[PDB]
Design an enzyme around this catalytic site. Structure first.
Site, mmCIF file in Angstrom:
data_model
loop_
_atom_site.group_PDB
_atom_site.id
_atom_site.type_symbol
_atom_site.label_atom_id
_atom_site.label_comp_id
_atom_site.label_asym_id
_atom_site.label_seq_id
_atom_site.Cartn_x
_atom_site.Cartn_y
_atom_site.Cartn_z
ATOM 1 N N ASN B 146 0.803 -1.221 0.000
ATOM 2 C CA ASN B 146 0.000 0.000 0.000
ATOM 3 C C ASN B 146 0.840 1.277 0.000
ATOM 4 O O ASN B 146 0.306 2.353 0.305
ATOM 5 C CB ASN B 146 -0.982 0.007 1.185
ATOM 6 C CG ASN B 146 -0.299 -0.231 2.526
ATOM 7 O OD1 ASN B 146 0.896 0.011 2.678
ATOM 8 N ND2 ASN B 146 -1.063 -0.723 3.503
ATOM 9 N N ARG B 284 3.520 7.350 10.982
ATOM 10 C CA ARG B 284 3.054 6.810 12.247
ATOM 11 C C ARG B 284 2.826 7.973 13.200
ATOM 12 O O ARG B 284 3.548 8.978 13.161
ATOM 13 C CB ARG B 284 4.053 5.814 12.842
ATOM 14 C CG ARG B 284 3.976 4.434 12.224
ATOM 15 C CD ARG B 284 2.580 3.829 12.365
ATOM 16 N NE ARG B 284 2.533 2.447 11.888
ATOM 17 C CZ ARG B 284 2.100 2.068 10.690
ATOM 18 N NH1 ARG B 284 1.675 2.967 9.814
ATOM 19 N NH2 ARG B 284 2.090 0.778 10.369
ATOM 20 N N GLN B 313 -4.149 3.481 18.583
ATOM 21 C CA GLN B 313 -5.120 3.148 17.546
ATOM 22 C C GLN B 313 -5.966 1.973 18.015
ATOM 23 O O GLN B 313 -5.412 0.894 18.286
ATOM 24 C CB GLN B 313 -4.425 2.815 16.226
ATOM 25 C CG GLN B 313 -3.622 3.977 15.659
ATOM 26 C CD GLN B 313 -3.492 3.924 14.153
ATOM 27 O OE1 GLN B 313 -3.293 4.951 13.496
ATOM 28 N NE2 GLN B 313 -3.612 2.722 13.592
ATOM 29 N N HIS B 332 -7.161 5.866 10.376
ATOM 30 C CA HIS B 332 -6.103 5.169 9.652
ATOM 31 C C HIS B 332 -6.671 4.374 8.482
ATOM 32 O O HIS B 332 -7.103 3.231 8.657
ATOM 33 C CB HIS B 332 -5.323 4.270 10.607
ATOM 34 C CG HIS B 332 -4.041 3.762 10.036
ATOM 35 N ND1 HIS B 332 -3.242 2.849 10.690
ATOM 36 C CD2 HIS B 332 -3.424 4.030 8.862
ATOM 37 C CE1 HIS B 332 -2.184 2.582 9.946
ATOM 38 N NE2 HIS B 332 -2.272 3.285 8.830
HETATM 39 N N1 LIG Z 1 -1.876 3.337 5.907
HETATM 40 C C1 LIG Z 1 -0.751 4.130 6.194
HETATM 41 O O1 LIG Z 1 -0.907 5.242 6.617
HETATM 42 C C2 LIG Z 1 0.636 3.547 5.969
HETATM 43 C C3 LIG Z 1 0.794 2.529 5.074
HETATM 44 C C4 LIG Z 1 2.030 1.994 4.852
HETATM 45 C C5 LIG Z 1 3.111 2.490 5.546
HETATM 46 N N2 LIG Z 1 2.951 3.511 6.447
HETATM 47 C C6 LIG Z 1 4.148 3.992 7.193
HETATM 48 O O2 LIG Z 1 4.991 4.531 6.390
HETATM 49 C C7 LIG Z 1 6.415 3.855 6.744
HETATM 50 C C8 LIG Z 1 7.260 3.868 5.524
HETATM 51 O O3 LIG Z 1 6.554 3.184 4.466
HETATM 52 P P1 LIG Z 1 7.447 2.657 3.176
HETATM 53 O O4 LIG Z 1 6.616 1.856 2.222
HETATM 54 O O5 LIG Z 1 7.982 3.860 2.451
HETATM 55 O O6 LIG Z 1 8.698 1.669 3.721
HETATM 56 P P2 LIG Z 1 10.279 1.796 3.138
HETATM 57 O O7 LIG Z 1 10.321 1.517 1.640
HETATM 58 O O8 LIG Z 1 11.236 0.873 3.884
HETATM 59 O O9 LIG Z 1 10.751 3.342 3.372
HETATM 60 C C9 LIG Z 1 11.331 3.548 4.600
HETATM 61 C C10 LIG Z 1 12.091 4.880 4.466
HETATM 62 O O10 LIG Z 1 12.265 5.418 5.920
HETATM 63 C C11 LIG Z 1 13.691 5.877 5.799
HETATM 64 N N3 LIG Z 1 14.219 6.326 7.149
HETATM 65 C C12 LIG Z 1 14.419 5.198 7.876
HETATM 66 N N4 LIG Z 1 14.887 5.627 9.106
HETATM 67 C C13 LIG Z 1 14.948 6.971 9.091
HETATM 68 C C14 LIG Z 1 15.327 7.946 9.989
HETATM 69 N N5 LIG Z 1 15.801 7.545 11.343
HETATM 70 N N6 LIG Z 1 15.269 9.226 9.655
HETATM 71 C C15 LIG Z 1 14.839 9.611 8.418
HETATM 72 N N7 LIG Z 1 14.467 8.684 7.521
HETATM 73 C C16 LIG Z 1 14.528 7.391 7.881
HETATM 74 C C17 LIG Z 1 14.341 5.002 5.145
HETATM 75 O O11 LIG Z 1 15.405 5.695 4.409
HETATM 76 P P3 LIG Z 1 16.926 5.675 5.031
HETATM 77 O O12 LIG Z 1 17.267 4.235 5.329
HETATM 78 O O13 LIG Z 1 17.887 6.237 4.018
HETATM 79 O O14 LIG Z 1 16.967 6.512 6.296
HETATM 80 C C18 LIG Z 1 13.232 4.615 3.999
HETATM 81 O O15 LIG Z 1 13.513 5.461 2.813
HETATM 82 C C19 LIG Z 1 6.124 2.617 7.088
HETATM 83 O O16 LIG Z 1 7.152 2.059 8.018
HETATM 84 C C20 LIG Z 1 4.829 2.736 7.825
HETATM 85 O O17 LIG Z 1 5.095 2.951 9.165
HETATM 86 C C21 LIG Z 1 1.735 4.043 6.669
#
Ligand SMILES: NC(=O)c1ccc[n+]([C@@H]2O[C@H](COP(=O)([O-])OP(=O)(O)OC[C@H]3O[C@@H](n4cnc5c(N)ncnc54)[C@H](OP(=O)(O)O)[C@@H]3O)[C@@H](O)[C@H]2O)c1
Ligand SMILES: NC(=O)c1ccc[n+]([C@@H]2O[C@H](COP(=O)([O-])OP(=O)(O)OC[C@H]3O[C@@H](n4cnc5c(N)ncnc54)[C@H](OP(=O)(O)O)[C@@H]3O)[C@@H](O)[C@H]2O)c1
Lengths: 383, 383
Positions: B146, B284, B313, B332
């Protein structure tokens, strides 16, 4: 000379003393190359409220300094109002489509001194073009001044309809959570077919914005865009509205209001759309039959409808688009964002300066001139 | 084996008997080339409500065909809940972030048979990862399922805050028109500075979708992107969040919740943002300090906040984000659109098919495996 300028009321909380941000971005030109308006001066700071009575489009000191008198009012309805009372004296009438001073043939017949009708914004359908042609009246608008603003509003509304934003926000305010009630009508836009009626300043801008959402793009207009432009955005062109809407999950209307587009989306055309299609209309209200939209929403032929334009304006308290199911309406606001006001206020002043200095008005601003559709008017309108 | 699965309630108007549309687009792969989930079979049509109690993520026939039991409930809070009562027995626990079965250390320690915790969605911060590591429990989630859905929600919310969508919608419902009240805080997004915290699967997708809006783009991550992509989207890198947010009109948060992002946007970081900045958090809830956001909105330091993620939540009825000024919240929901549900439900089945047939779970689905962060967990999370 007397300039008659109709603007909307101040906010009911008073004309603002401050604003949420300190300034607005400087917009130098538009896509495709048209320059931003070029008045010799602006008597305002971009970001201020210009379209309301107190804002005066920043026009008073410039006009009164030339020896003219400027009447600013929001009172535009009735025969004993300020607008229709001052109309027989006005050489120039100005108003915005969001609070439009309707220039009917009956009102134009009374406006014995009227020579210039300025649309402070885009879209001059609130003027009777046939009567203005007849009486030798020049009609101008600030082409491109809020085209980008509307294209942002469109993508916003498409996403809100498809993803079901507004009923979901309402559960937050009711104190609920209700995920299943929110998402039983929530979809992604990704890989849907989206089509626009018109690919002009707004339409092209909507297509460019839609492209990175990985949708399948469609367009219908009387003249095709350059083939190179079509291939760069992945557009399929359609020779008729009907041919386009039958394969679209989402349809956007971005055409002007003229005989070609009046009552276009009626019962018949809407019935040819996909069951559960979404319709967005930021163009003009009357391009969609009022009752045909309500009626397809109640049946589910339309899964949702959204737009900012109505007829008439202001919409009456009992206008049924307020209460029809599955809408995401706003009042007519997208083209009068503070950012956009800065541009069409400057353009309004540019036109006045051209008029009073006896310089010609930018060809792209023109709609009718010298007893004919001219400039952008001959390109985009019909009479 | 016993599978314990926690889901949100059916709609209060009943499990739907029909849907707004006939089908949803088939998504073959994700940007970058990762394939969509590959279960041997699915027992649903994409578009059906799968994440509610009656949907069961389409797992029942499959699991009972193999002789396993599947227990489904929404009752998840506290020691006296169906979830806690069924937990000591479960070899596999599944829940969705939108209605999350919190796997605290205490609950994990009582789950005597637990070997696999699956996130039906993306984001496994509802599982205590250190306790999973210590107890040898595999934690998995349907990576990318998603991410695109959220990137859509983000652009929807940025535009809604900046253009002032929701208050203008309410003026329609109240029977009004009130242009100046709508637009005294309405702006265009064009040429604003927008930055994202993270440019991962969601964050990059956000940046691609924002680019044709003609914004100036910024980002911060721990790992800088190469020249090719920074130059292709016009990205300015900042070595810290502080450096980004002080030049940003709009900030998006798209990182996971782990110790490096917990309480990141506190009073002090928010105070370094621009006066009138807009803040969007679909990532989050706890990445933003709950009360600091309220204070900044009450003071005008933030002109607007919007997101779909809360803590806890479900958010309680008196949660201050429901009532703070100038918000455009939803519950959410973004990652549980009907289209997203088809993908992570298929992904949940692929993972279970791998579990029970002793095939490896996709490395990119893994968060913890073999007593350490692994796969995507090691790339994106900290412990
Ligand atoms: N329904 C919703 O609202 C929904 C749905 C899906 C996901 N989400 C949230 O969105 C998060 C990310 O989703 P995603 O699909 O993009 O996963 P992802 O592909 O693994 O993207 C994670 C990104 O967070 C970065 N990051 C990690 N640690 C960090 C830090 N300490 N400071 C700044 N940047 C950091 C990582 O980049 P770097 O390693 O370079 O730091 C990575 O680019 C998920 O973990 C989830 O919690 C919400
Ligand atoms: N606040 C607001 O909601 C707002 C703000 C600004 C404008 N608008 C409305 O949007 C209209 C257009 O905006 P714009 O800046 O894009 O003007 P524009 O640049 O002149 O584009 C108008 C396009 O409509 C096309 N079209 C004309 N007649 C058509 C027809 N009968 N069927 C299908 N397509 C047709 C024209 O192309 P072809 O000649 O090839 O057909 C043209 O590309 C305005 O006239 C105004 O009514 C609304």
């Amino acid at each position: 000379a007397k300039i008659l300028c109709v603007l909307y009321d101040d906010p009911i909380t008073g004309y603002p003393k401050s604003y949420a941000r300190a300034d607005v971005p400087k917009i130098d030109h538009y896509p495709g190359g048209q320059t931003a308006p070029t008045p010799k001066q602006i008597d305002f700071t971009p970001g201020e409220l210009l379209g309301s009575v107190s804002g005066e489009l920043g026009l008073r000191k410039y006009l009164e300094g030339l020896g003219h008198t400027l009447v600013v009012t929001s009172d535009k309805e009735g025969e004993d109002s300020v607008f229709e009372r001052e109309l027989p004296d006005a050489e120039i009438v100005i108003s915005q489509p969001f609070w439009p001073a309707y220039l009917t043939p009956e009102r134009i017949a009374k406006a014995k001194k009227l020579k210039l009708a300025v649309t402070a914004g885009i879209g001059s359908d609130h003027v009777d073009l046939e009567a203005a042609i007849k009486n030798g009246i020049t009609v101008a608008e600030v082409t491109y001044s809020n085209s980008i603003s509307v294209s942002e509003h469109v993508v916003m509304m498409i996403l809100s309809l498809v993803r079901n934003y507004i009923p979901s926000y309402q559960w937050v305010i009711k104190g609920g959570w209700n995920i299943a009630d929110c998402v039983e009508r929530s979809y992604d836009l990704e890989a849907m077919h989206v089509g626009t009626v018109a690919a002009g300043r707004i339409g092209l801008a909507v297509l460019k914005r839609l492209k990175p959402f990985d949708v399948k793009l469609h367009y219908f207009q009387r003249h095709r865009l350059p083939e190179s432009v079509e291939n760069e955005l992945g557009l399929t062109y359609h020779p008729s509205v009907e041919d386009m809407v039958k394969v679209c999950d989402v349809v956007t209307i971005n055409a002007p209001l003229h005989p070609g587009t009046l009552d276009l989306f009626n019962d018949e055309l809407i019935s040819k759309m996909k069951r559960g299609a979404y319709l967005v209309n930021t163009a003009r209200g009357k391009i969609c039959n009022r009752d045909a939209v309500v009626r397809a929403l109640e049946s589910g032929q339309l899964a949702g409808y959204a737009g900012d334009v109505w007829f008439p304006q202001p919409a009456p308290k009992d206008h049924p688009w307020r209460t029809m199911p599955h809408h995401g309406m706003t009042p007519h606001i997208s083209g009068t964002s503070l950012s956009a006001q800065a541009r069409y206020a400057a353009g309004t002043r540019e036109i006045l300066e051209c008029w009073f200095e006896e310089r010609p008005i930018r060809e792209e601003y023109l709609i009718v001139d010298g007893g004919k559709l001219a400039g952008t008017g001959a390109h985009s309108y019909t009479v």
